[PDB]
């Protein structure tokens, strides 16, 4: 009988039957239905009658079982007395020669904090005063303590009965087996006795002595219990810069992340931390101790650095461990992050050296070039390293492989003015075999800026200019680029001037030069030719032309703040980006009142009628996410009764199977068809059910992408900013205004709120409230705001859309 | 009696350089145990062959691995043990950063907070001294 | 009490047999055991996993969870050790875990629970000790 709540009639029958097995099974079936929480008092006389005196342990044990989980509730066969049918003949049970029945009886009897059993539990310590097992003596210290807990904090429970009444706790210390139920409030002499016992311990018992009294002067003295306290005590005597090298903490710690890569990744972190405490700049974070595994002697054999190499990773162990490991290389050794990121990047970025680090997918290659290159932009020393490695990247000599390479290096030159003169000659080489945009773009920029340095350019450019591949974006990049630097410093059959001619043709003009350009018609609609066409005031010469622009870098460009940079090593970053970091007539009148922060729905129940409505009961219901914190409890609604009855309200619950409308309120009365009527007290909305939750800009952005929010409305009374009406109203449809999606200035400055919720509707809810408050001569519609809304199938989107207008209720009875 | 157990050991002068069951190469000076270096794996001291300028270690292999003994550290610390704190300071220009702070801490443990203050690179160790 | 309940669960969505040492967790016992042990106590194949602010210690046996629950704790070794001793005692009564056979020996298991953990404090048990009681 797993859980069957109607079966009590059969149990009575089964409980006495003249067959002992049946009786045991019955009583067992009662236990299992109560434990789940089901019907049990009908049976009581039957249950109690067979078992009572006997020394036959199994039925007695079963009855003994049922007296610690419901004795108080059941009363057919027990009623209320001092020597109840729980203990009257269980004084026999306590005083049987078999330890088990006595012991069991003692154990339940003393366990209860019952006051209708207080006297019978007190000399119940007799059953276990003699200690036939470790179990008997432990059973005794726990039972005396449980007696002490049960209203006997004074002389009824404190001395000895004949050996224990609160003194097993003392005795246990010096006896062969220990266990101290003495944790609080008990004899001082036993506490003292436990200390002595630390030495003459029994190990289970030591965990009991130890919860009470901890800290040792020793190293130990033995056993897991003492050992477990000991690592706590050690952390005290050296708190300083974490544990560093984990103590006896290490054993539990592995299981704490049994799923399976995460342990190594964590372990790797600690091992890296431990090596050294470095400068602790941007991603140079290694704490713990400065010297404890050093770094870097030149006589150390086979050195520290061997372990450091693991941390430099491509994936060399698996991805979770990889992400931890790349950060960890950066963390022990660099200048900041820059130094060790360049080494690390050199390995990752595409080459002709190894083909286990090159790939023909263009974005990844490109990104890897940008990561290597960002280190230079960060720190100078890296410029010198980067440029020759970049030329190796080029040497791959696939159209695309060159292409990616050329694209970053060209950015580097914008930063690094006439420093990378050397690269230009390498960069031209792979520009001729071509099937893509990227190669043309980049090459034309290097060869263009670099012209003073070289003289090749008609020849290199011209094979490509009459070759094909994909050429949209090529136009833009060649347009600003081709002439640049020194007015007449090249010549192969086209000097720098031919280049300016070319540069202009490629931009949007027409001219025979480099055997004509591939295309002329520019990239995306805004860019066009014209700016540059106007430009080249002084023909490709460092002055105030293309050259200027080329040998200068747009805004601030420093660090790895992503200003001509990309922020570490490209593969590690994907993982970091991913991390969102999300945090019968009846009359009612009613108002909601709050006194001393108690929120209640006031209801007055009125019988305007002369007719009888007796049988009157009042209930507030649990609909779904609405709940009663206590229904109105008066038996009112009688002939010409006016009553004030208070129903307390909650807003947060779990969905019930009954209707999901406004608030259900139920009054009952006389009638047999409609004994229960549902009638209303004032408004509560569907919107309550939504649950508020919040987003950060990353979670908002991810969800924006994840599912559409095209749906918009413009809501009146969003004249005001985010903070005022809009927040308060948004709150009531369990929403909250978080992070921005705005871009403010002297022409821009709609207020933008990123909203989130996680509705109990199987959807989230998100929105952006844009408040069109004029920051221009031509506003949208002046003050008002357009709320762009969604939910996960946009079923709550709509709630956001209208619950940001207005919202107010009041009455004054 | 020395803290780190001696799995195997060797005498270089009256100083005992030994391996430990922690994989630590330590040296005994003064009845104090200092760690000269950390061994990454389990290693045994074959002997010290002046020719190679090395201590020859062997793993499980009947082959050679070599650790040169860090004499400058050892001499700084040995001098400290003898209570020749000044003498150990002469060694200090050839004790690097964190090692000067450590050797300083050795000097200090033996006694004389001030001489330890001059050698300690780290300002914090100076500040406390 | 430190130990709220000691409970044998079926991840059928119910507490098959369970023990409330002193009247506190009656119906409460079934809801906790029913939700949490279904997800492996929300574990990942880790003996300690804590969910809804209640420490669940467990061991899977078939579609069943033998579960210890605490919301307070005195020592690391101890919580496992009562569960462990319980796991010696449970196949003597029910021949592994299995809902029907667990159900039939509600009395056996329940009695062991009272004996093993008394007023939430982890006493010790053994298969021979168990015998005197069910005799």
Query: Is there contact between B and A if contact means ≥3 C-beta pairs under 8 Å?
Result: yes
Chain B nearest-CA residue for A292: B38
Contacts of A301 in chain B (CB under 8 A): 37, 39, 57, 65-68
Q: Which two tokens stand for residue C101?
A: 């056979």
- The 8-class DSSP code of residue A472 comes to T
Residue the block writes with tokens 């050093």: A294
Please give the helix or strand (H or E) that residue A70 lies within, else none: none
Q: Which two tokens stand for residue A675?
A: 């004994």
CA dist A727 and A717 (Å) reads 12
DSSP A630-646: E--------TT-EEEEE
A72 in contact with C, Cβ within 8 Å: yes
3-state helix, strand, coil in chain A (%, to 5): 40, 10, 50
Q: Which two tokens stand for residue A807?
A: 């919202």
Q: Which residue from B37, B39, B65 is facing A297, i.e. has the nearest CB?
A: B37
Contacts of A277 in chain B (CB under 8 A): none
DSSP A231-270: HHHHHHS--TTS-SS--TTHHHHHHTT-SSHHHHHHHHHH
Contact at CB, C133 and A69, closer than 8 angstroms: no
Helix runs in A395-550, H state only: 399-415, 424-428, 437-449, 457-465, 474-481, 496-507, 530-534, 546-550
B38 in contact with A, Cβ within 8 Å: yes
Handedness of CA A443, A444, A449, A452 (dihedral sign): positive
CA dist A801 and A796 (Å) reads 9
Q: What SS3 class is residue A593?
A: strand
Strand partners, A789: A767
Asked if residue A646 lies in contact with residue A600, where contact means CB atoms within 8 angstroms, the answer is yes
Strand partners, A666: A619, A678
Q: What is the arrangement of strands in the sheet containing A627-630, beginning at the earlier edge strand?
A: A587-595, A598-606, A642-650, A627-630
Asked if residue A489 lies in contact with residue A449, where contact means CB atoms within 8 angstroms, the answer is no
Q: What are phi and psi of A163, to 5 degrees?
A: -155, -30
Q: How many CB atoms lie within 10 A of CB C90?
A: 24
What B111-116 contacts at long range (C-beta under 8 Å, 24+ apart), as own/partner pairs, is B111/B83, B111/B85, B112/B85, B115/B85, B115/B86, B115/B88, B115/B89
Q: What are phi and psi of A756, to 5 degrees?
A: -155, 160
Q: Which residue from A300, A306, A307 is facing B37, i.e. has the nearest CB?
A: A300
Contacts of C49 (CB under 8 A, 6+ apart): C40, C41, C42, C43, C56, C58
Please give the helix or strand (H or E) that residue C69 lies within, else none: strand C64-70
Separation in Å, CA of A326 to nearest CA in chain B: 22
A631 in contact with C, Cβ within 8 Å: no
Asked if residue A696 lies in contact with residue A736, where contact means CB atoms within 8 angstroms, the answer is no
Contacts of A465 (CB under 8 A, 6+ apart): A502, A506, A514, A515, A516, A517, A518
Angle between helices A437-449 and A474-481 (to 10 degrees): 0
Chain A nearest-CA residue for B39: A301
Q: State the Cα angle at A37 between A36 and A38, rounded to 5°.
A: 110
CA atoms within a 13 Å half-sphere pointing along the CA-CB vector of C1: 19
CA atoms within a 13 Å half-sphere pointing along the CA-CB vector of A457: 34
Asked if residue C121 lies in contact with residue C6, where contact means CB atoms within 8 angstroms, the answer is no
Contacts of A79 (CB under 8 A, 6+ apart): none
Contacts of A231 (CB under 8 A, 6+ apart): A247, A248, A249
Closest alpha carbon to B69 in B124, B6, B10: B10
Closest alpha carbon to A696 in A583, A578, A579: A583
Closest alpha carbon to A710 in A751, A749, A766, A669: A766
Asked if residue A753 lies in contact with residue A769, where contact means CB atoms within 8 angstroms, the answer is yes
CA dist C90 and C109 (Å) reads 7
Q: What SS3 class is residue A491?
A: coil
Q: Which two tokens stand for residue C15?
A: 């507490």
Q: Which residue from A299, A302, A307 is facing B65, i.e. has the nearest CB?
A: A302
Separation in Å, CA of B70 to nearest CA in chain A: 7
Contacts of C83 (CB under 8 A, 6+ apart): C57, C58, C59, C66, C68
Q: What resolution in angstrom units was achieved for this structure? A: 13.0
CA dist C67 and C60 (Å) reads 9
Q: What are phi and psi of A253, to 5 degrees?
A: -60, -30
Q: Which residue from B66, B68, B98 is facing A291, i.e. has the nearest CB?
A: B98
Q: How many CB atoms lie within 10 A of CB A66?
A: 23
Chain C nearest-CA residue for A34: C26
Contact at CB, B102 and A306, closer than 8 angstroms: no
Q: Which two tokens stand for residue A747?
A: 């022409």
- The 8-class DSSP code of residue B111 comes to S
- For residues A626, A632, A638, A642, the Cα torsion angle rounded to the nearest 10 degrees is -100
Residue the block writes with tokens 């210390």: A173
Closest alpha carbon to A676 in A624, A619, A636: A619
DSSP A106-130: HHHHHH---STTHHHHGGGGGGGSS
Peptide bond before A701: cis, by omega within 30 degrees of 0? no
- Radius of gyration of the CA atoms of chain B, in A: 15
C5-10 and C121-122 as β-strands: parallel, antiparallel, unpaired?
Answer: unpaired
Please give the helix or strand (H or E) that residue A30 lies within, else none: helix A20-36
Q: What are phi and psi of A278, to 5 degrees?
A: -90, -160
Closest alpha carbon to A165 in A110, A242, A93: A110
- The 8-class DSSP code of residue B30 comes to B
Contacts of A294 in chain B (CB under 8 A): 38, 98
Closest alpha carbon to A46 in A69, A76, A15: A15
CA dist A201 and C109 (Å) reads 31
CA atoms within a 13 Å half-sphere pointing along the CA-CB vector of A22: 12
Q: Give residue C31's region: left, alpha or beta (phi > 0; psi -120 to 50).
A: alpha
Contacts of A109 in chain C (CB under 8 A): none
Residue the block writes with tokens 């992503």: A562
Please give the helix or strand (H or E) that residue B100 lies within, else none: helix B97-110
Separation in Å, CA of A300 to nearest CA in chain B: 6
Chain-centroid distance, C-alpha A553: 40
Q: How many helices (H) and strands (E) does chain A have?
A: 31, 12
CA dist B116 and A48 (Å) reads 85
Contacts of A134 in chain C (CB under 8 A): 124
A108 in contact with C, Cβ within 8 Å: yes
CA dist A359 and A691 (Å) reads 47
- The 8-class DSSP code of residue B58 comes to E
Closest alpha carbon to B79 in B15, B122, B19, B8: B15
Separation in Å, CA of A681 to nearest CA in chain C: 33
Please give the helix or strand (H or E) that residue A179 lies within, else none: none
Catalogue the E-assigned strands of A659-792: 665-668, 676-679, 712-715, 736-737, 751-757, 765-771, 785-791
Neighbours of chain C (3+ CB pairs under 8 A): A
CA dist A36 and C16 (Å) reads 8
Contacts of B66 in chain A (CB under 8 A): 301
B37 in contact with A, Cβ within 8 Å: yes
CA dist A757 and A790 (Å) reads 11
Q: Which two tokens stand for residue C11?
A: 């991840």
CA dist A124 and A140 (Å) reads 10
Contact at CB, B57 and A299, closer than 8 angstroms: no
Chain-centroid distance, C-alpha C69: 7
Q: How many CB atoms lie within 10 A of CB A168?
A: 31
CA-to-CA separations, A399 to A151, A157, A405, A433, in angstroms, rounded: 90, 93, 10, 6
Neighbours of chain B (3+ CB pairs under 8 A): A
Separation in Å, CA of A274 to nearest CA in chain C: 27
Handedness of CA C31, C33, C38, C39 (dihedral sign): positive
Please give the helix or strand (H or E) that residue A625 lies within, else none: none
CA atoms within a 13 Å half-sphere pointing along the CA-CB vector of C33: 33
Q: Which residue from B65, B101, B122 is facing A301, i.e. has the nearest CB?
A: B65
Closest alpha carbon to A372 in A570, A577, A576: A570
Query: In chain A, after which residues is the C-to-N distance over 2.5 Å, breaking the chain?
Result: 583
CA dist A417 and A424 (Å) reads 13
CA dist A208 and A191 (Å) reads 11
* A 638-667 → C contacts, CB under 8 A: none
Q: What SS3 class is residue A497?
A: helix
Contact at CB, A301 and B102, closer than 8 angstroms: no
Q: Which residue from C78, C104, C123 is facing A135, i.e. has the nearest CB?
A: C123
């Amino acid at each position: 009988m797993d859980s069957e709540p109607p079966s009590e009639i059969s149990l009575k029958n089964d409980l006495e039957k003249g067959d002992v097995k049946s009786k045991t099974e019955a009583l067992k079936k009662v236990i299992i239905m109560i434990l789940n929480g089901e019907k049990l008092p009908g049976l009581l006389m039957t249950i109690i009658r067979f078992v009572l005196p006997l020394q036959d342990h199994t039925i007695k044990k079963l009855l003994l079982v049922f007296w610690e989980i419901v004795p108080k509730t059941t009363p057919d066969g027990r009623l209320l007395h001092e020597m109840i049918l729980v203990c009257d003949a269980y004084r026999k049970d306590l005083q049987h020669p078999n330890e088990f029945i006595r012991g069991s009886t003692l154990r339940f009897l003393c366990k209860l904090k019952e006051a209708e059993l207080l006297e019978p539990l007190m000399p119940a310590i007799r059953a276990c005063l003699e200690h036939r097992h470790s179990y008997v003596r432990r059973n005794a210290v726990l039972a005396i303590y449980t007696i002490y807990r049960n209203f006997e904090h004074l002389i009824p429970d404190a001395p000895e009965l004949i050996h224990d009444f609160l003194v097993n706790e003392k005795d246990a210390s010096c006896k062969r087996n220990a266990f101290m139920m003495l944790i609080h409030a008990d004899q001082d002499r036993a506490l003292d006795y436990l200390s002595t016992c630390i030495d003459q311990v029994q190990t289970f018992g030591d965990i009991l002595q130890l919860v009470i009294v901890e800290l040792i002067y020793k190293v130990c003295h033995a056993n897991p219990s003492e050992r477990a306290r000991f690592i706590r005590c050690i952390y005290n005597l050296l708190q300083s810069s974490s544990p560093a090298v984990k103590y006896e903490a290490a054993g539990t710690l592995v299981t704490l992340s049994s799923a399976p890569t995460a342990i190594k990744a964590a372990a790797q972190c600690y091992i890296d931390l431990i090596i050294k405490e470095s400068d602790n700049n941007v991603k140079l974070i290694v704490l713990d101790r400065l010297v404890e595994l050093k770094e870097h002697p030149a006589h150390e054999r086979v050195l520290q650095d061997l372990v450091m190499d693991i941390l430099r990773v491509l994936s060399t162990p698996d991805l979770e461990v990889r992400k931890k490991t790349l950060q960890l290389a950066l963390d022990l050794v660099s200048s900041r992050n820059v130094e060790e990121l360049v080494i690390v990047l050199k390995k990752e970025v595409i080459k002709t050296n190894n083909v286990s680090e090159h790939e023909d997918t263009d974005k990844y290659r490109q990104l890897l070039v940008r990561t290597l290159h960002s280190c230079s932009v960060r720190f100078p020393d890296m410029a010198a390293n980067v440029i020759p490695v970049l030329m190796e990247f080029l040497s791959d000599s696939n159209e695309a492989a060159a292409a990616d390479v050329l694209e970053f290096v060209r950015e580097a030159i914008q930063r690094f003015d006439n420093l990378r003169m050397l690269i230009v000659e390498k960069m031209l080489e792979v520009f001729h075999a071509i099937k893509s945009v990227k190669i043309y773009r980049g090459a034309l920029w290097i060869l263009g800026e670099y012209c003073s340095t070289k003289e090749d350019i008609q020849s290199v450019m011209t094979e490509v200019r009459r070759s094909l591949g994909e050429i949209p974006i090529v136009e833009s990049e060649i347009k600003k680029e081709a002439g640049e630097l020194k007015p007449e410093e090249e010549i192969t059959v086209g000097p720098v001037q031919k280049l300016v001619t070319e540069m202009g043709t490629y931009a949007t003009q027409s001219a025979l030069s480099s055997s004509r350009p591939t295309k002329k018609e520019e990239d995306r609609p805004p860019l066009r030719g014209f700016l540059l066409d106007g430009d080249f005031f002084v023909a490709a010469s460092l002055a105030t032309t293309l050259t200027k622009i080329a040998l200068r870098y747009v805004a601030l460009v420093q660090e790895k703040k992503k200003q001509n940079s990309f922020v570490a090593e490209a593969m590690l970053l994907m993982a970091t980006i991913l991390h969102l970091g999300k945090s019968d007539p009846v009359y009612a009148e009613a108002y909601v009142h709050v006194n001393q922060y108690d929120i209640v729905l006031d209801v007055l129940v009125v019988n305007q009628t002369s007719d009888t409505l007796q049988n009157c009961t009042l209930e507030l219901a649990t609909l779904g996410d609405l709940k009663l914190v206590e229904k109105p409890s008066p038996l009112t609604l009688a002939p010409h009764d006016f009553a004030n009855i208070k129903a307390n309200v909650k807003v947060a619950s779990t969905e019930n199977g009954i209707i999901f409308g406004n608030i259900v309120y139920d009054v009952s009365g006389a009638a047999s068809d409609r004994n229960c009527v549902v009638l209303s007290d004032i408004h509560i909305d569907i919107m309550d059910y939504i649950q508020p939750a919040t987003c950060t800009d990353a979670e908002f952005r991810q969800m924006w992408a994840e599912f559409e929010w095209e749906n918009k409305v413009t809501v009146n009374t969003n004249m005001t900013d985010l903070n005022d009406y809009l927040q308060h109203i948004l709150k009531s449809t369990n929403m909250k205004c978080l992070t921005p999606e705005k871009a403010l200035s002297g022409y821009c400055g709609f207020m933008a709120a990123n909203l989130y919720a996680r509705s109990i509707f199987g959807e989230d809810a998100l929105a952006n409230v844009s408040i069109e408050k004029p920051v221009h001569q031509g506003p949208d519609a002046a003050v008002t705001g357009h709320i762009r809304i969604r939910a996960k199938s946009q079923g709550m989107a709509l709630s956001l859309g209208d619950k940001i207008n207005l919202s107010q209720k009041k009455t004054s009875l | 009696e020395i803290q780190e157990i001696v799995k195997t050991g060797l005498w270089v002068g009256d100083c005992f350089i030994y391996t430990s069951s922690v994989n630590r190469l330590n040296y005994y000076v003064g009845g104090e145990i200092v760690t000269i270096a950390h061994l990454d794996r389990t290693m045994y001291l074959l002997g010290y062959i002046p020719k190679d300028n090395r201590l020859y270690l062997g793993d499980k292999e009947l082959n050679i691995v070599s650790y040169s003994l860090l004499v400058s550290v050892l001499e700084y610390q040995t001098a400290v043990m003898r209570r020749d704190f000044s003498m150990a300071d002469k060694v200090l220009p050839t004790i690097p950063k964190e090692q000067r702070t450590r050797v300083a801490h050795f000097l200090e443990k033996q006694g004389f907070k001030q001489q330890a203050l001059t050698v300690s690179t780290d300002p914090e160790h100076r500040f406390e001294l | 009490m430190v130990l709220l309940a000691a409970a044998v669960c079926t991840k059928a969505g119910k507490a098959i047999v369970s023990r409330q040492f002193v009247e506190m967790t009656r119906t409460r016992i079934e809801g906790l055991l029913a939700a949490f042990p279904k997800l492996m106590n929300t574990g990942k194949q880790h003996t300690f996993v804590e969910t809804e602010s209640v420490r669940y210690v467990y061991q899977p046996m078939e579609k069943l969870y033998m579960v210890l629950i605490t919301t307070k704790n005195s020592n690391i070794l101890e919580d496992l050790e009562t569960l462990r001793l319980f796991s010696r005692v449970i196949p003597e009564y029910c021949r592994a875990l299995e809902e029907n056979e667990i159900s039939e020996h509600c009395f056996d298991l329940i009695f062991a629970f009272d004996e093993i953990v008394a007023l939430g404090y982890r006493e010790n048990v053994n298969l021979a000790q168990i015998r005197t009681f069910t005799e």
